[PDB]
Design a protein around this ligand. Structure first.
Ligand SMILES: *C/C=C/c1ccc2c(c1)C(C)(C)c1cc(N(CC)CC)ccc1-2
Length: 133
């Protein structure tokens, strides 16, 4: 269950607005984001990942190597500098983003053709589920 390769289509998205509000994204743009169809495209080779989230108005890409800290500028989101680090905790892929916000990061659970994603910031957790296309 350590294979996240694929195109992933959203099945559920809970507390999306609370998570976006914790990150301080504009109320008006949060309203638009909650209606957009989001597609997750992941390419994974060894320790190297390319992750792409696509919608009609907002796009987000990140590339990283498991175990190698990297500087991340969330130019597409809340426009903050964080020190990001992605690791394996068993079969869970864990990202911690050190910076202004506490408890910032995300976890992914690849159970066959289903991907569970939890985005955290502060006291907010957004839970998403995707199915491999
Ligand atoms: C490993 C998965 C990480 C991941 C999955 C889905 C999204 C993100 C990161 C964000 C934080 C980049 C993000 C932002 C949005 N917005 C509304 C469209 C604001 C740009 C949606 C989905 C994801």
């Amino acid at each position: 269950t350590r294979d996240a390769n694929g195109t992933w289509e959203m099945e559920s998205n809970e507390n999306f607005e609370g998570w976006m509000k914790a990150l301080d994204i504009d109320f008006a743009l949060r309203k638009i984001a909650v209606r957009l169809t989001l597609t997750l495209v992941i390419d994974q080779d060894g320790d190297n990942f390319k992750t792409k989230c696509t919608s009609t108005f907002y796009n987000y890409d990140v590339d990283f190597t498991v175990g190698v800290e990297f500087d991340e500028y969330t130019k597409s989101l809340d426009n903050r500098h964080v020190k990001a680090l992605v690791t394996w905790e068993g079969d869970v892929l864990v990202c911690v983003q050190k910076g202004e916000k506490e408890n910032r990061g995300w976890k992914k659970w690849i159970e066959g053709d289903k991907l569970y994603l939890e985005l955290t910031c502060g006291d907010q957790v957004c839970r998403q589920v995707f199915k491999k296309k």
